[PDB]
Amino acid sequence: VSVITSEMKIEVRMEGAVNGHKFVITGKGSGQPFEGIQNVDLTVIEGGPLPFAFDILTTAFNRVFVKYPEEIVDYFKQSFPEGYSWERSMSYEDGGICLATNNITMKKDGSNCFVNEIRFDGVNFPANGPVMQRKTVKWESSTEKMYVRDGVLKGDVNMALLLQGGGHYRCDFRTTYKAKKVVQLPDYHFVDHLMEITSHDKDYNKVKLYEHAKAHSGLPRLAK
Amino acid sequence: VSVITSEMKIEVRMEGAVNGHKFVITGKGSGQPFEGIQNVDLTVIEGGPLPFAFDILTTAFNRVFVKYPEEIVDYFKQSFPEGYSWERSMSYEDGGICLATNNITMKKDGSNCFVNEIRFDGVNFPANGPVMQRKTVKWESSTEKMYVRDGVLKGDVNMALLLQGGGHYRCDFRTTYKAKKVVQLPDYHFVDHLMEITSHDKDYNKVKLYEHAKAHSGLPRLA
Ligand SMILES: [Mg+2]
Ligand SMILES: [Mg+2]
Ligand code: NA
Ligand code: NA
How many C-beta atoms lie closer than 10 Å to residue B29's C-beta?
23
B49 with B205: CB under 8 angstroms? yes
User: What single letter denotes the amino acid at residue B185?
Assistant: L
Could you tell me the resolution of this structure in angstroms?
1.5
The Cα–Cα gap between B191 and B2 comes to 20
- Nearest beta carbon to residue A124 from set B17, B151, B176: B176
For the CA of B199, the nearest ligand: 2
CB under 8 Å to B64, separation ≥6 — which residues?
A: B4, B31, B33, B76, B77, B79, B80, B104, B114
The Cα–Cα gap between B89 and B14 comes to 16
B84 with B77: CB under 8 angstroms? no
Q: Measured between alpha carbons, how far is residue B101 from residues A21, A51, A82, A135, B223 in Å?
A: 10, 17, 33, 24, 40
Whether the link from the prior residue into B130 is cis, omega within 30° of 0, is no
Judged by CB atoms closer than 8 Å, whether chains meet at A99 and B122 is answered as yes
For the CA of A185, the nearest ligand: 3
- Nearest beta carbon to residue B123 from set A19, A89, A103: A89
Range of the domain at B112: 1-223
The Cα–Cα gap between A122 and A21 comes to 9
CA A100 to chain centre: 10
A184 with A164: CB under 8 angstroms? no
After which residues does chain A break, using C–N > 2.5 Å?
Answer: 61
Q: Measured between alpha carbons, how far is residue B201 from residues A52, B2, B47, B98 in Å?
A: 42, 38, 15, 24
Say whether residue B53 is in contact with chain A using an 8 A CB cutoff: no
- Number of domains making up chain A: 1
CATH code, B95 = 2.40.155.10
Phi, psi angles (nearest 5°) of residue B75: -60, -40
How many C-beta atoms lie closer than 10 Å to residue B202's C-beta?
7
Chain A residues lying within 8 Å of B95, measured CB to CB: 89, 174
Judged by CB atoms closer than 8 Å, whether chains meet at A124 and B150 is answered as no
Closest listed residue to residue B57, CA positions, set B105, B106, B13, B114:
B13
Phi, psi angles (nearest 5°) of residue A150: 50, 45
Spell out the SS3 assignment of B151-166: CEEEEEEEEEEEECCC
Residue B55 to chain A, least CA–CA distance (Å): 20
Q: How many C-alpha atoms does B102 have within 13 Å on its Cβ side?
A: 25
Judged by CB atoms closer than 8 Å, whether chains meet at B127 and A150 is answered as yes
Phi, psi angles (nearest 5°) of residue A40: -145, 130
Following CA atoms A144, A149, A153, A158 in sequence, which dihedral angle do they give, to the nearest 10 degrees?
Answer: -20
Q: Specify the pairing of strand A113-123 against strand A8-18.
A: parallel
What is the residue-wise DSSP string for chain A?
-----SSEEEEEEEEEEETTEEEEEEEEEEEETTTTEEEEEEEEEESPSPSS-GGGTGGG--TTSSB--TTS--HHHHTTTT-EEEEEEEEETTS-EEEEEEEEEE-SSTT-EEEEEEEEEEE---TTSTTTTT-EEEEPPEEEEEEEETTEEEEEEEEEEEETTSSEEEEEEEEEEEESS--PPPPSEEEEEEEEEEEE-TTSSEEEEEEEEEEE--S-SS--
B107 with B113: CB under 8 angstroms? yes
For the CA of B55, the nearest ligand: 2
A48 with A26: CB under 8 angstroms? no
B9 with B30: CB under 8 angstroms? yes
Say whether residue A17 is in contact with chain B using an 8 A CB cutoff: yes
Hey, CA dihedral for B148, B161, B39, B97, is it positive or negative? positive
Radius of gyration of chain A (CA): 17
Say whether residue B20 is in contact with chain A using an 8 A CB cutoff: yes
Closest listed residue to residue B196, CA positions, set B84, B33, B55:
B55
The burial of B189, by beta-carbon neighbours within 10 Å (0-12 exposed, 13-18 middle, 19 or more buried), is given as: buried
The Cα–Cα gap between B106 and B84 comes to 10
- Residues facing residue B170 across a β-bridge: B160
Say whether residue B180 is in contact with chain A using an 8 A CB cutoff: no
Q: Considering only alpha carbons, which residue of chain A is nearest residue B21?
A: A101
Judged by CB atoms closer than 8 Å, whether chains meet at B20 and A99 is answered as no
The Cα–Cα gap between A44 and B164 comes to 46
Q: Specify the pairing of strand A152-163 against strand A136-139.
A: antiparallel
The Cα–Cα gap between B187 and B145 comes to 11
User: What single letter denotes the amino acid at residue A215?
Assistant: A
For the CA of A70, the nearest ligand: 3
How many C-beta atoms lie closer than 10 Å to residue A169's C-beta?
21
The Cα–Cα gap between B156 and B153 comes to 10
For chain B, percent helix, then strand, then coil, each to nearest 5?
Answer: 5, 55, 40
Say whether residue B133 is in contact with chain A using an 8 A CB cutoff: no
Q: How many whole angstroms from A110 Cα to the centroid of ligand 2?
A: 48
Q: Considering only alpha carbons, which residue of chain B is nearest residue A149?
A: B126
Closest listed residue to residue B99, CA positions, set B18, B13, B204:
B18
Closest listed residue to residue A202, CA positions, set A44, A18, A13, A32:
A44
b or e along B107-140 (b: 16 or more beta carbons within 10 Å of the residue's beta carbon)?
eeeeebebebbbbbbbbbbbeebbbbbbebbebe
Judged by CB atoms closer than 8 Å, whether chains meet at B99 and A103 is answered as no
Closest listed residue to residue A105, CA positions, set A212, A12, A215:
A12
What is the residue-wise DSSP string for B33-100?
TTTTEEEEEEEEEESPSPSS-GGGTGGG--TTSSB--TTS--HHHHTTTT-EEEEEEEEETTS-EEEE
A57 with A67: CB under 8 angstroms? no
Q: Considering only alpha carbons, which residue of chain B is nearest residue A129?
A: B150
Q: How many whole angstroms from A136 Cα to the centroid of ligand 1?
A: 7
CA B103 to chain centre: 12
B201 with B100: CB under 8 angstroms? no
- Nearest beta carbon to residue B97 from set A17, A99, A150: A99
The Cα–Cα gap between A146 and A173 comes to 12
CB under 8 Å to A51, separation ≥6 — which residues?
A: A18, A19, A21, A132
Chain A residues lying within 8 Å of B127, measured CB to CB: 150-152
B17 with A117: CB under 8 angstroms? no
- The H-or-E segment that residue B20 falls in is none
